[PDB]
Amino acid sequence: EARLESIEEKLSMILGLLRTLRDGIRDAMIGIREELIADIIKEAAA
Amino acid sequence: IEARLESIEEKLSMILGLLRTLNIATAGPTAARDGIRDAMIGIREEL
Amino acid sequence: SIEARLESIEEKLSMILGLLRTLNIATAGPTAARDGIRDAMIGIREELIADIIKEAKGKAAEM
Amino acid sequence: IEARLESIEEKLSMILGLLRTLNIATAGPTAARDGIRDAMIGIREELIADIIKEAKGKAAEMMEEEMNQRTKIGNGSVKLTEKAKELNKIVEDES
Amino acid sequence: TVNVYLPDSYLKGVISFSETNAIGSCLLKRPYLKNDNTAKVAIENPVIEHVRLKNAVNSKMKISDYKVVEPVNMQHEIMKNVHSCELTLLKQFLTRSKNISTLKLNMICDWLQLKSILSFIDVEFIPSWVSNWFSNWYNLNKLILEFRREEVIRTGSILCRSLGKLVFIVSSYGCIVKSNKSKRVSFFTYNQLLTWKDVMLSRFNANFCIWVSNSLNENQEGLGLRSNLQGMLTNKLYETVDYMLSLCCNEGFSLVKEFEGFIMSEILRITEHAQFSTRFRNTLLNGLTDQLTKLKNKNRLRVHSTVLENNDYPMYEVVLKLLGDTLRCIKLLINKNLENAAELYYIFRIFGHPMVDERDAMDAVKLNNEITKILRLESLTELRGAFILRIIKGFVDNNKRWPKIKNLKVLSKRWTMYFKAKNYPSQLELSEQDFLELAAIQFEQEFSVPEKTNLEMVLNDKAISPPKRLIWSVYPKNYLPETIKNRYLEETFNASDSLKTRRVLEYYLKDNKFDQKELKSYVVRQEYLNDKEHIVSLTGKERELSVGRMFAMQPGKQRQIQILAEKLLADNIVPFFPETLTKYGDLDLQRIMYIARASIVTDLSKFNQAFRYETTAICADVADELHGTQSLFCWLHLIVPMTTMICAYRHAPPETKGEYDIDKIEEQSGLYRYHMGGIEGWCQKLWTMEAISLLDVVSVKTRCQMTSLLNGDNQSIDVSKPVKLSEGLDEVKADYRLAVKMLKEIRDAYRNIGHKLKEGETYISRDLQFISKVIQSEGVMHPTPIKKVLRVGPWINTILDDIKTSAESIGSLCQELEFRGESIIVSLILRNFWLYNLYMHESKQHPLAGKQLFKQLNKTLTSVQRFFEIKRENEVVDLWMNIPMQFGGGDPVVFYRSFYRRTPDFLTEAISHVDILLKISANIKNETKVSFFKALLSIEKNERATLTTLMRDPQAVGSERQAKVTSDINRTAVTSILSLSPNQLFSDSAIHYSRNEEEVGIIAENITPVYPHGLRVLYESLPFHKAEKVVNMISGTKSITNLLQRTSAINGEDIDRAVSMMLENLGLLSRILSVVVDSIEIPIKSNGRLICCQISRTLRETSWNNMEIVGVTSPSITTCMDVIYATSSHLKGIIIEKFSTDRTTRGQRGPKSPWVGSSTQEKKLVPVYNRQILSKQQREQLEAIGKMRWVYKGTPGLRRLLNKICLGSLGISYKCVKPLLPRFMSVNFLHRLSVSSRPMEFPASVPAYRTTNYHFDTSPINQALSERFGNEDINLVFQNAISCGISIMSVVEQLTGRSPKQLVLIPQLEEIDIMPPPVFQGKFNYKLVDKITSDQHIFSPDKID
Ligand SMILES: COc1cc(C(=O)NNC(=O)c2cc(C(C)(C)N)cc(-c3ccc(F)cc3)n2)ccc1OC1CC1
8 A cells, every 4th residue: 555655645746747738857867877887797706 | 466467567667657757859849959968978987 | 357457557557658669769769860869869779888897997997 | 546547547548559650751952952951750640741842852752752742553463554565466376 | 006996886875855956056156946955054064075076967958948957757768768679689688598498307306206397488488577677777887987986096076877768867965867868857866876776677677577487487387486467557557657646746655555455455455355455445545545645745845935936746647547547557457366466566666766855754754753642550550560460470480589669568468468379460460450559569689780881782883973063074164165165174173082973982992081881871870961061963765666765863972871771671671571572583473373353453664653652651661670770771861852963964064143052943844952852762672562561451341362463563463352242243243342342452552652653554354464564364465576686697795796795685585485485497597697697798807906806707617617618608607606605606596495404514515515416517537536536635634723713613624615605705804904003901812813813723623523513602602702703794895994084985905905805716716627636535435426424524624634523514305315206115214294185285374384494402401590680691601611511521631621711701600600500411412412513493394284285205215224323313414314304295286287195215324323422631831811910801701799
């Protein structure tokens, strides 16, 4: 009943941003850098 | 019963992630269209 | 059908995930490439990652 | 509990409808032949109206014939035009 | 010191609209054919060549006394002009060809046991619809050859000659024709002078072939070709179309284009039910009449403000009547006969070629490559899902696993369990939602980009564009302003020698700072996205019969990227798509051949210009993910829209306002910038894959079974579906309904992606009938015999006019009348006609050699006479022209080639041919015919036995008994040129080449016995091999000593070398007959005949100092086998029997499957490991090392040599690659070894359908062989014996009207020997390889980490 609460909350956000079809650049930057370091770790010894 | 719920939550998380980038190319203004270029040119030297 | 009422949810939201993937690929084109934002839209692909490591280690070795 | 499942089902169904009916207009010249206009997304009719109001001259025509009009064929059987019947009468006769 | 400009003899090029306009505008001082910028520049600042042409013309009669017309208004008068008659010459040629042909016919009938047919060709009554074309061609060709001879002496020459009532003034840069009868003048190019000649030649060849076939078939049916064409009606067709094209100036070729469609409609009427045929015919007629209506305005718009504006155009009615008459002529030639319709496919050439406008096709495609396209997201994602599903299936089938998936959380439970189980659903599953939810998957890197640049990939003999700033170098200086010229001279001083070349070879060999690791960094860093110096040029070179087809061209840097992307797709991803890769050779020709069945044949010719980034990226992204790159498979739509389209042809300039930068010049008829579509051929594989994957979605949406074949530019979709609806309209209406419904579905599917299929390019049918452009109906194939023999004549397919290559080409082209057509006599007659013309009439005058050649020929002709004591000089040429070329005679077809296609041991075949030729020749004494072989065996074998010759050519002979070739004589010159180049890598490789060549032969010198095919394998296992390819690619360039100079002319050294080779190969027969040793024993047989296999083996052994070769000698089926005719009664031979009872067998099919002679080689125990990461070159290395390990076992030094090779090539030890190597389990590699130089198929010399109606029994011959030999292997090839038997069945029916019911081939056991597996003794010289691998490392593969 807890994961569903987050689920119902996020559907409203998803529809809100989908109806438009400032801050997203920073989100994209942090997102790419999130997996860039992990991929580098895997690529870099065994 | 429980794997399905967490899988649904993860898939919605990726849905939100995708929906964030979709409004930089066409839905986003051309003025801020060049903002990410500085960071991208900086990634080669940020690591 | 309690366990079947949320597996259809999963399939449907995976379908919209595929739709959004295709939409994201489509909109990052010649306009995005010239402004140097296409790679942030698609991401890094294990090949530019090796390139940066080699120069980073090469410079570190040159020390 | 159960009701929220139905609510999320409705939300997903309508999101699927919206994403199924969505259309894309490709990137191209800005109608001033100076720069490239980026791709657009929206409903088919509004995109067509905007693009046609943008188009000038012969280009517009082919667009009208390439996205609005289409080949209307039923049970095949293409009819030969009146001018093409004269070729037929000169070719298939006196042989 | 001496540079020559030998012109062309055949078209081999393109007719230019702008060059003609420039010539005419310079001569008239008014626009000609058009009022574009070309006319302006030509009027104001004409080029020096056109000024000289103008002066030459003015010195002669004045131009204002005649009506100026286009060169195409003159064909009717040019094709009807009569000069001196040439009937006696034609009679002489025909008589001599008949003599040579009767000698060969005696040869065949002697051993086929047969017992005046050439008398059916009556030379005194030639129709005169064959003679006129011969006379026209003779006169025009004489003029052209005289001009070529004159031009070789002086750089720029103008020659004037009178041909009847026409006067020609010919030059290398322009031509004029004036007609006194009509009082009119025309201006054209050197092309349009030797295309009219080609039209005359083709008309003569076609009419001659049909006349000969009709003469043969009127006395014995089945002796000639299986098609009955009237020749008078073909002459009428030629004249009518000539007149129609003359009236309709140059827009009439778009009207000639529809003859193929008309023939297709006739075939469909013959073979199908009215519903399909009427639809096709009506669709054709509507478009044809639309074009007919639109013709007049096009011409009247083009010729505005021109000298031709005052000429009158034909009205609608006259052109309509002309079309009616020509279509009547075509329809009457097809007398409801499907063989005539397939026969008439040769008329697409017989009328001439159109004059292509460089700046008009570009304009026509501009607006197609510019419009915005509205796309549906759902279909766009379904296509991506189908592509991903194809990839998944390919990996699951080949590797038994899924590709690596970045995130295993975008999958539902169904696809999650499918992932865990490592399989995929069946076609009955996979609804649309499956594609939608599959399109969410992202792959990880499964492949790789090679770090080193593949020198065999980039290096080619092609052209490249200049950079953006150095683009004014493609136009004459006179055509440009002064400021442009000054700034261009300033700019060309700052450029390097590599950024000044328009050729790839000079682009690389002249590079001073080349690096093999540069391309990897270039691709990974995406240093092509924002390139100011990027440009796409469109030189406008095209192909046949089209008003526009632009050949695109690029600078070298991005050319590398295009080549690399195409190669990576071909190597890694084109597999998984059997529909496309298997198109040519297996899929369509033989493999593919109530439940309703139908076919759709949509075209994909103009497929690239409707593609956009949004339609290509959805799959190029999957390719990038698999290969790990960022943007390498979608470069085109990322870079092309940012640059300028130029159309940089030599003459047509742009109208610049005096500014250097092309990106600043306003868009014109030849310039535009925002090109949103695709370029033709640059990303063809990806677009093909998308087209294939769209049909998967279409098939899933409906529930039909679709199979797709991609034969060229056509897509053939064969559709099946259980109709489950009957009791009304039974069978034909069901097929029609299925076809219509699926046509609607396919057109809708293509529309949703952005392609608007035209009504005139897609059609429906009941069964596929034009796959790869071959007409096959009901299992019988109807050939187009006279389509490859239209241009047979003197000096064909020769860079420099050398008789050897020209004779080989004549023979090769005429052998098709035997392979495809079912007539051997027609092919013999044509071949000997043209060979006699070449040798005895055209060798007296050579542009570069003079009379020398003929003198040489006349000496060889004397010697043979003196050797054979021939009384009459006329019958010594007959004998000489039936001797193989390998011994120094003129005969570019060996005997066996008429019965089976492939063989080992060419030498034994040549020996057998000469033996039978001397056997039938009841003109020489018996002593001399046995003395010829003693002369052949008299050798001076004491010479250097280098084993690299056998590595290059396992079937090579030594001691100068062989004929020399171009590669072996140009090798030293090419290496010497490469040694002096700025590129350090190439210079070092060329410096070490000689030593590496001398050392590669020493590795296995002390190994016995010598197995030349094992030596070939060892050769392939070394990097030297690859270098030896590059040299051979540069040897064939027509100018070796001018590679590093910008001359585009043939140097004197090259001419001297070529002439020396040509003159030295013409005396080989004289050389071998000079010395005879009388102490040589010929192995005569107990039949009174000589054993050809033993003589061949002795000759091969002696020429190599008696070094006991093994595995190369094998008997010829023509001499080790005796053919007789019975009914299940004879002594232990192979029996060939006929299924049916009918007399003849042409045009029928039988119950049996087609006979293809396969080898069933190398029973192989392949390993089980991942091979996806390895490039193709590394896989070939592993295969070569495996073959080396298999062939040589227990030989001392083998393991050390293998370790050296593995370390040199792959960089890792031999014991670390042992698991990766394949394991062969077989004892006889003399039989099972598969390697180049060793044929892997043994087909018969008849079409496939003809082999389906015979069957063979080999039990008695097996019993006889087991009685004589043991159970071990022998020399005789079995596939080849069966092939020869089938071809005998066919040829006997050809020569005699009755096909034998059964024939038996008895083996003669004195010609057959055994090949037990050999045991090798001696130690390998394994050290040398090290050095080689060090100095040829630029051609090595990438080292395995
Ligand atoms: C593919 O390259 C080759 C293949 C062969 C080949 O196939 N050798 N043949 C037999 O070993 C064989 C054995 C037997 C036995 C087992 C005794 N019954 C019978 C027959 C046989 C033949 C014709 C017939 F009409 C009937 C039976 N042949 C030979 C040489 C080849 O290339 C190298 C010379 C360069």
